[PDB]
Each structure stands twice: as structure tokens, then as C-alpha cells.
Design a protein around this motif. Sequence first.
Motif, short mmCIF file in Angstrom:
data_model
loop_
_atom_site.label_atom_id
_atom_site.label_comp_id
_atom_site.label_asym_id
_atom_site.label_seq_id
_atom_site.Cartn_x
_atom_site.Cartn_y
_atom_site.Cartn_z
N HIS A 256 4.01 -8.96 1.15
CA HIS A 256 3.38 -9.97 1.99
C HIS A 256 1.89 -10.07 1.70
O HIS A 256 1.34 -11.18 1.63
N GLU A 257 1.21 -8.93 1.54
CA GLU A 257 -0.23 -8.94 1.36
C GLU A 257 -0.63 -9.60 0.04
O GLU A 257 -1.59 -10.37 -0.01
N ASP A 258 0.11 -9.31 -1.04
CA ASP A 258 -0.20 -9.91 -2.33
C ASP A 258 -0.06 -11.43 -2.26
O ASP A 258 -0.93 -12.17 -2.72
N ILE A 259 1.05 -11.91 -1.68
CA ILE A 259 1.26 -13.34 -1.58
C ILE A 259 0.18 -13.98 -0.71
O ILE A 259 -0.35 -15.04 -1.05
N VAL A 260 -0.16 -13.34 0.41
CA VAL A 260 -1.12 -13.97 1.31
C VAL A 260 -2.50 -14.03 0.68
O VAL A 260 -3.22 -15.02 0.83
N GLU A 261 -2.89 -13.00 -0.09
CA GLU A 261 -4.20 -13.05 -0.72
C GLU A 261 -4.24 -14.07 -1.85
O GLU A 261 -5.21 -14.82 -1.99
N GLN A 262 -3.16 -14.15 -2.65
CA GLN A 262 -3.12 -15.17 -3.70
C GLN A 262 -3.14 -16.57 -3.10
O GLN A 262 -3.82 -17.46 -3.62
N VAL A 263 -2.40 -16.79 -2.01
CA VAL A 263 -2.37 -18.10 -1.36
C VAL A 263 -3.75 -18.44 -0.82
O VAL A 263 -4.27 -19.54 -1.04
N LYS A 264 -4.37 -17.50 -0.11
CA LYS A 264 -5.70 -17.74 0.45
C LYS A 264 -6.71 -18.04 -0.64
O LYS A 264 -7.63 -18.83 -0.43
N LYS A 265 -6.55 -17.44 -1.82
CA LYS A 265 -7.45 -17.73 -2.93
C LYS A 265 -7.15 -19.07 -3.59
O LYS A 265 -8.08 -19.74 -4.07
N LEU A 266 -5.89 -19.50 -3.61
CA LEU A 266 -5.49 -20.66 -4.40
C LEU A 266 -5.44 -21.97 -3.61
O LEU A 266 -5.90 -23.00 -4.11
N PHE A 267 -4.90 -21.96 -2.39
CA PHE A 267 -4.67 -23.21 -1.67
C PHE A 267 -5.96 -23.69 -1.03
O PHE A 267 -6.36 -23.27 0.05
N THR A 268 -6.63 -24.61 -1.73
CA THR A 268 -7.81 -25.30 -1.23
C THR A 268 -7.64 -26.80 -1.49
O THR A 268 -6.60 -27.25 -1.98
#
Lengths: 70, 49
Positions: free
Chosen positions: B1-13
Motif C-alpha cells: 500500500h505504501e509504495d503505491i500511495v507514494e508513487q501515486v502521490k508523486k505522479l498524479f498531478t
Amino acid sequence: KGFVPMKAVTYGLSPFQQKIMPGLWKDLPTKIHHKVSENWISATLLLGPLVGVYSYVQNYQEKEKLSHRY
Amino acid sequence: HEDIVEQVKKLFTKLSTDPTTASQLVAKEPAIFTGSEVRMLDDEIPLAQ
């Protein structure tokens, strides 16, 4: 006594979704005018001979009665 | 969960921030059930449905 292949398409609506009574008295005068204008000849042909014969008989009878007097 | 959430937070803008949800778009224009029929008669088909 049989049936035929048809190919038609129809749409319908439920009974409980539409006003029923107001259709009777909507536009009466134009319907009355249409009926009269269409069937005046039938009415004439039905009611002519009766009137003619009645008037003729009345006239004949009154003439005869008044000619028999003293 | 943490890996996906950090990648998403970095990517989805760059996403549009419109403050509109589905509740308003469905609250108006509701779904009303009427009750009717449609009959499609063909008669060159072997089966009815």
C-alpha cells in the motif's frame, strides 16, 4: 379463418397515466358542424316524404270536411 | 500500500479541481419509472424474445 404475416411496430402507454374524461367535450361545435354538413342529404331524404304526405293528407281532409258543410 | 500511495502521490498531478460530485448531477434529473410497452413485430424470425 387464418392470419397473415405483418411486420409492424407499435408503442403504447399504461391506462393509469393519461386523462380520460376531458376528451368528450373538447371541441364540440366543429364536430357538430362536420356531422351536419356530412349528413344533411341523408336527413333530407329521410324526412322529406313524411312531411309531404302529412301536409297533403291534412289539406285534403280539411278541404273535404269544409266542403261537406251547409 | 505504501509504495503505491507514494508513487501515486508523486505522479498524479495536473488534474482539474472541479468541486462537483455525482450527488448534484443526479439530484436534478432523477430517474422516474413510467410504464409502457414496445412491440416489434417481424414474423420472418423463427423465435420470439
